[PDB]
């Protein structure tokens, strides 16, 4: 079996191996610095560390079983997978991470968990999982702030452990700056030790202060360096949140910039107030119903195959309901679907007038149109979604008395979304289909007779 | 009004403000009444009366105002009462309003009433749409959130003090003063991470202070990031204009362009930025829908272009295409729109400013002055290429804005319309 | 009538000359209102400075009546029309309200109350105008933006210092630990100590720094909370403005590095060779080092046809007139051809053209030196310096030429070369409006070929 | 020999001269303000100062030997380089940097190291190096973080020296705000002096406070000014780090914006759920394998010559392997390479089915294309990278039995990267090559006769 890295099984294993990596990255230094934490729950640490080592071994097996892309295809040969895993630095990192340094537990005793710090060398795996999460989650900003919170909490936890270790090296309660005497019943509680160390670390690593001033020179140096790290950390939090705020509001900021630009244009051009109100209502409607993005610019990022398939899935049935395209070759229909151009109209907008040159076929997608009697107060017929007009005028039919010109005035009753196929687009598609061109000419002739 | 538009009705947005005020009363006074002892049995009637008023506003919102809201179906405004009611009932906003409306003397039992936040977002959207330069309000809105967080923080602190007894330690609230401004002061010193408070002693106090400071770091970061986004969005156009002008100035400095041409370019940049607020209008034009772009071009230039005798009797869509192909060009004072003897290839439509036609002996004589809305040089459009020369010097009296249509764009339009093309050739051979 | 041009330097100088009394009012009026000793001790100096500021305010109203505005592209010079334009503006109302003679209220209130001059603060907009005009005139926009932001925060801090001193006065000096101490103290009774300690308190609060004596009364608690909230807004504004400015200065490097990274990703993606990757990286290092990253088409795209034409003329007209075929061409044709020149940049060792390639464009050397080399490229026949050109016959498309738009020489860039190409299509498009000049160009090319013997 | 400013040797010298400039910018003010630092290690300071001055002299000599680009060529003339350096302000700055102010030690005394402050005027040389490192390092964000940290460290160290000097001027221990009495056994230690001054400066310049409050008016004023400066410093740090963070995920933000716009379109158009899943999986494939940026816009940034060289290096051999283009002129091959258009296909995608219009020539850059039957489950032949099909279709050959139609079904087995040469692009490139067009048509006619067609 070969695990697809883009599959859900790979992401599930990413989480399943991230749990021991996070457990190591926090609790190894937590037990190394807080001796009471290691001593009190030593059996639990032994079970959890053995389980984490087993999951590390299974992670190496997964990496041997993880496929990769060559020639656009997932490599499923076992020997190639082994060679690809062993060639990378990650194999060396995994081997160094699973070096049996726990044997020093028999030498240095049960109070030295820092020998397991090599397990932290699985760190990249952890990062990979979160990277995949930022590609997979439907709430990228919530996950991003959670990721930042967790990384800041991990760094604060590490600095809390460092502060406790420095206090231990100097001496508990030897001065006012260090953690106080742990022989005291209140200060000697493990919960009190860890929580006050975390409080000190959070305060110093966020430019808050509110901690006893350092007394010794090494304490002054450590406080200075850790406040510099805290300035960096606070600036990192502020920059991450500011980038998040900019990114969430980027689409709204762009739409608002377009709003302000068009408003300034109609102020500067002395555009009539009714037209101004129509433009503002049009933009508000496009934003409210999530339509303001131009379809060509959105779809241009897609490849031609996916864009063509989406265009087919949107337009193929509607274009096949057209009576001039009722019985056509599939490729011609696909090309004509690709040649469709989106148009939008406000309520009261005139798509075409009588006497206008007709060079486009309009097909209604999400609107209502009306045929008016040159006055606009009466409507002959309302054309609903899926209807079309101008299918004859795009065909160059000889002997047509009403050809090349529009015979009816088409008014947009509301906000109508149409798709237009120009005559030039039809001819460009028909140069590759001569038989379809002749059939279209004959169909238009037969329609014009009746 | 039998049917009310949720977008453009001022009475509706006033009612939205009323619903927002009721929601704000719930959100700001549920934690106060839960934490602080301000909900005494002596003054319980004021709290009950205002809660009843807020619930009545909620009920009139869910029943009267929201069911009369017109909506958009298929791009059509729908004011049919049954359709309006069904659209409201199917909506998630009705579900949120029902979830807030249920009751569930304890102030925390009113916590469902805080779930009517969609009214707040709708009112915010209406406020952003109504008034220009909206980011200022956004700052206030962001500040409001900060205040509310401090408010929540304040209440939490009091509960923590009430969980440990007032004055039991130096960390908790002592018990003197207003008891809300003291807890709000603690919330300000913590949630802004200012510090200076009495240090926490017990494990509960240290945990509370740690979590409070952490939330304060992130809330202060949220406030700073919101203000940074506001500043970056407010000055984005000015920054873009300054960057374009500086890039142009650097270009002219690399090529040793003299001070006269550089000053003219800077003058055009400054005048364009101060007059139309954008360097290029066609960049905005291409972003619009084609119908909107066409109707704007019609509203700007159609009467003037259709007043021109050269294009009388021509097809209306060819006129519209010429309107779409018009380009706005700003000429500096004393600039030559047409030089005597140069090739005439452009149609000039004075959108703004004055244009002087020169003549007479030795030049420097103003034969005629053309104001805005006057068209000259359109005869040069109907030329074979090199067949038209400008007869008189034509100069810009001040900063004049002209809508220019050149011969190439007119020909590119004319190949589409054979009738108008034939009419223009007939007029060209008729006038000579 | 004599009209001040708002875009002129005289208007900017007067903006400075009116900004000085506006700043003096905005600081010192509240300083003297809140610090009583400051008003009482220097009363003659304050009266003289207030009279000077009022005189400058009157002259500012006169300048506003004499300041023209652009209507239909013309500076308005009619005195009645300028007066009506000023009066219709809200600034006239603010200037009248700022010059209301409230200094007579001294006789009603004594010299202790300079708050009557607070209406002078309504000239504030003039101050703002000067600064924004400075932001359009200075060559250091970011340094000036930093200075303006700092000055605004210093004024707000000074105002809050005055407010804190006034609140301590209302509560009572030395009554509790939060207020300013008792003013009968020899150290804290000094006016300099009063203002400077109030400024210290205000800086600490408005920067959300703290480390001040905690409030003792409910009114003090309210003021401290409100003032730290104002400080939150101030601090967020400072950091946001500086971050926006930093992003603005780093935007050009950000987009250049993003383009470099995208190109590097493309070369790793398409497996481009290592030497070609090194050539691309060296090219982009050359671009960033020499400040040549700007695209001339993108830089000049917003400019109108006349101004782009003038710039292009000043860059290229002499060297295009030095061309033999374009020597006798009409000035307008030269303008169009110069506008159609497209910049090309060649690395050292790059072949602009080789023998046997199709010649569709004419290259004019703006900067650099090119070499006519043989097939091997080791030897050089002649080095073309800046202002030289080649390929003028290829763009003409002369019938009967033995070359037939094909290069007869190998042109190699010895160093970095900035050339400007005039394509055959662009030449013909420019020649559409000049048929006689096109015929003259074709005749010139034909005669050149006859002299060279290439025509048959 | 003339040093190339863009070379490696120039950058190595930039580091070698930045080291004395950083040494001056820290230790000159450190010894000026902390008198015990100057007096206790005076011999070491004199040796290091002489070394720094020697390296400054070599830096000026390097300025005389640093070529500049004139007409795109490095100027290698000695007098030209000397004159170009002398005309610049940097020559004056370097001369002012190396004024022999060390003689004034004989006048002021050994306790006045401020005389070497003019060496700080070599700062330009320092900043340039970091700018060059910002263009040279593979990790721009790591180096820019380190550069910002280093600037903040020097600023805090300078403010620490300023605080200690202000305490010295006012008097050590004269009040609670200044540095305490230096006759104390603990606070009289030079290490304690520097670490407490640095701690004070870190507290004040990072908007923390927690220092003893000022007592004198000058101390209050200096505290106001220095907390304002620290607010500016913190805002600058936040702005730089936020600009970095924005620049890191700008590509990710743009990709997510494109994905969100596509998703909004698909929800608008009621596109089928399977198609939406295919689009989302495709964009995830683009992000995972670093194929997000389109080739067209990326190649637009390069110049025409460099873009042509990139295109040649990517496509020239695989275009020359095509049998119609094998015997073709080099310029036509270059033009056709520049005409090649990138197409990427998902697994299971169809390049073309039978009956489709063949107006473009597909060349497999990477991936495998299967020739499948009507059912699509039976595979005829698998074409690896460098293979091509439809070369005859792009030639408008008279008498072809299969006119602009596909005779085989071509399926993408995996994610296939390929380049299409349309018939229109081939004709447009061949308009300048009439003999090559004739040869291509004749070769296509010969191939059609050889393969039994026509």
Compose a concise summary of this entry.
Chain A has 450 residues and is an alpha+beta fold. Chain A has helices at 8-33, 35-40, 42-65, 78-87, 89-97, 104-108, 123-136, 140-170, 190-204, 217-248, 250-268, 273-288, 295-299, 304-320, 330-338, 423-430, 434-449; strands at 69-70, 73-74, 341-345, 350-352, 360-364, 369-372, 379-383, 388-389, 409-412, 416-422. Chain A has a domain at 296-449: Jelly Rolls (Sandwich).
Notes on the structure:
It is classed as transport protein. The complex is a heterotetramer, with 3 copies of chain A and 1 copy of chain B (432 residues). Chain A is of the alpha+beta class and 450 residues long. Chain A has a domain at 296-449: Jelly Rolls. Chain A is 58% helix and 9% strand. Chain A contains 17 helices and 10 strands. Chain A has helices at 8-33, 35-40, 42-65, 78-87, 89-97, 104-108, 123-136, 140-170, 190-204, 217-248, 250-268, 273-288, 295-299, 304-320, 330-338, 423-430, 434-449; strands at residues 69-70, 73-74, 341-345, 350-352, 360-364, 369-372, 379-383, 388-389, 409-412, 416-422. In chain A, strand 6 and strand 7 form a beta hairpin. In chain A, helix 8 (140-170) crosses helix 9 (190-204). Chain A is elongated. With 432 residues, chain B is α+β, with helices and mostly antiparallel strands. Chain B folds into 3 domains: 1-130; 237-279, no CATH class; 283-431, Jelly Rolls (Sandwich). Helices cover 57% and strands 10% of the residues of chain B. Chain B has helices at residues 10-35, 44-65, 81-90, 92-101, 118-130, 135-164, 181-191, 203-234, 236-254, 259-276, 281-287, 290-307, 316-325, 407-414, 418-431; strands at 71-73, 76-78, 327-331, 336-338, 346-352, 355-359, 365-370, 375-376, 394-396, 400-406. In chain B, the strands form 3 sheets. Chain B has a 4-stranded antiparallel beta sheet. Classes of the chains: A alpha+beta (450), B alpha+beta (432). At the A-D interface, strand 2, helix 7, helix 10, helix 13 and helix 14 of A face helix 8, helix 9, helix 10, helix 11 and helix 12 of D.
């Amino acid at each position: 079996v070969v695990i697809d890295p883009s599959g859900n099984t790979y992401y599930n294993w990413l989480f399943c191996i991230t749990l021991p990596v996070m457990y190591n990255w926090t609790m190894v230094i937590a037990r190394a610095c807080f001796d009471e934490l290691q001593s009190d729950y030593l059996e639990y640490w032994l079970i959890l560390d053995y389980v984490s080592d087993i999951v590390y071994l299974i992670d190496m097996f997964v990496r041997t079983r993880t496929g990769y892309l060559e020639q656009g295809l997932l490599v499923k040969e076992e020997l190639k997978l082994i060679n690809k895993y062993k060639s990378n630095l990650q194999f060396k990192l995994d081997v160094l991470s699973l070096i049996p340094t726990d044997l020093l537990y028999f030498k240095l005793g049960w109070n030295y968990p820092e020998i397991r710090l090599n397990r932290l060398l699985r760190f990249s795996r952890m990062f990979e999982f979160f990277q995949r999460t930022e590609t997979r989650t439907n709430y990228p900003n919530i996950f991003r702030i959670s990721n930042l919170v967790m990384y800041i909490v991990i760094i604060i936890h590490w600095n809390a452990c460092v502060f406790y270790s420095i206090s231990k090296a100097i001496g508990f309660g030897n001065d006012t700056w260090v953690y106080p005497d742990i022989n005291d019943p209140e200060f000697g509680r493990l919960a009190r030790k860890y929580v006050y160390s975390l409080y000190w670390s959070t305060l110093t690593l966020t430019t808050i202060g509110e901690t006893p001033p350092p007394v010794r020179d090494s304490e002054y140096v450590f406080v200075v360096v850790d406040f510099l790290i805290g300035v960096l950390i606070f600036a990192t939090i502020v920059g991450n949140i500011g980038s998040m705020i900019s990114n969430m509001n980027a689409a709204r900021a762009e739409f608002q910039a377009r709003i302000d630009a068009i408003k300034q244009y109609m102020h500067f051009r002395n555009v009539s107030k009714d037209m101004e109100k129509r433009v503002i209502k049009w933009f508000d409607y496009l934003w409210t119903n999530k339509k303001t993005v131009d379809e060509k610019e959105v779809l241009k990022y897609l490849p031609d195959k996916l864009r063509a398939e989406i265009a087919i899935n949107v337009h193929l049935d509607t274009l096949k309901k057209v009576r001039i395209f009722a019985d056509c070759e599939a490729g011609l229909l696909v090309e004509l679907v690709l040649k469709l151009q989106p148009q939008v109209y406000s309520p009261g907008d005139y798509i075409c007038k009588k006497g206008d040159i007709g060079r486009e076929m309009y097909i209604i997608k999400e609107g209502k149109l009306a045929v008016v009697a040159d006055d606009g107060v009466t409507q002959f017929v309302v054309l609903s979604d899926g209807s079309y007009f101008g299918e004859i005028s795009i065909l160059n039919i000889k002997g047509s008395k009403a050809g090349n010109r529009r015979t009816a005035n088409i008014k947009s009753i509301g906000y109508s979304d149409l798709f237009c196929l120009s005559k030039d687009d039809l001819m460009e598609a028909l140069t590759e289909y001569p038989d379809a061109k002749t059939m279209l000419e004959e169909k238009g002739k037969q329609i014009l007779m009746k | 009004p039998q049917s009310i538009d949720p977008l453009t009705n001022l009475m509706y947005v006033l009612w939205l403000f009323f619903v927002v005020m009721a929601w704000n009363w719930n959100c700001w006074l549920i934690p106060v009444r839960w934490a602080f002892p301000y909900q005494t049995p002596d003054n319980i009637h004021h709290w009950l009366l205002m809660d009843y008023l807020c619930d009545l506003i909620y009920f009139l919102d869910i029943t009267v105002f929201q069911t009369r809201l017109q909506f958009v179906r298929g791009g059509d405004i729908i004011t049919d009462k049954k359709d309006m009611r069904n659209n409201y009932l199917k909506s998630r906003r009705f579900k949120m309003d029902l979830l807030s409306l249920l009751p569930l003397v304890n102030p925390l039992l009113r916590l469902p009433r805080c779930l009517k936040y969609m009214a707040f977002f709708e009112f915010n959207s209406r406020l952003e749409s109504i008034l220009s330069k909206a980011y200022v309000y956004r700052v206030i809105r962001t500040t409001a959130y900060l205040l509310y967080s401090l408010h929540l923080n304040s209440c939490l602190y009091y509960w923590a003090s009430a969980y440990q007894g007032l004055g039991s330690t130096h960390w908790v609230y002592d018990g003197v003063g207003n008891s809300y401004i003291r807890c709000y002061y603690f919330a300000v010193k913590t949630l802004i991470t200012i510090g200076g408070l009495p240090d926490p002693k017990t494990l509960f106090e240290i945990v509370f202070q740690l979590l409070n400071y952490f939330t304060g770091v992130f809330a202060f970061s949220v406030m700073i990031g919101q203000m940074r986004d506001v500043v970056g969005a407010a000055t984005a156009g000015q920054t873009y204009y300054r960057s374009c002008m500086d890039s142009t100035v650097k270009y002219m400095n690399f090529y040793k362009i003299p001070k006269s041409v550089q000053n003219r370019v800077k003058t055009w940049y400054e005048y364009t930025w101060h007059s139309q607020g954008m360097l290029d209008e066609s960049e905005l034009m291409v972003q619009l829908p084609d119908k909107m772009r066409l109707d704007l071009a019609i509203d700007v230039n159609y009467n003037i272009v259709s007043k021109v005798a050269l294009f009388q009797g021509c097809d209306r869509q060819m006129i519209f295409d010429m309107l779409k192909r018009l380009r706005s060009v700003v000429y500096l004072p004393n600039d030559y729109v047409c030089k005597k003897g140069e090739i005439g290839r452009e149609m000039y439509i004075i959108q703004a400013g004055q244009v002087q036609v020169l003549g007479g002996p030795d030049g420097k004589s103003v034969l005629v002055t053309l104001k805005a809305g006057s068209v000259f040089g359109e005869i040069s459009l109907l030329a074979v290429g090199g067949g038209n020369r400008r007869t008189a010097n034509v100069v810009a009296h001040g900063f004049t804005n002209l809508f220019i249509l050149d011969k190439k764009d007119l020909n590119e339009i004319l190949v589409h319309y054979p009738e108008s093309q034939k009419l223009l050739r007939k007029k060209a051979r008729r006038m000579l």
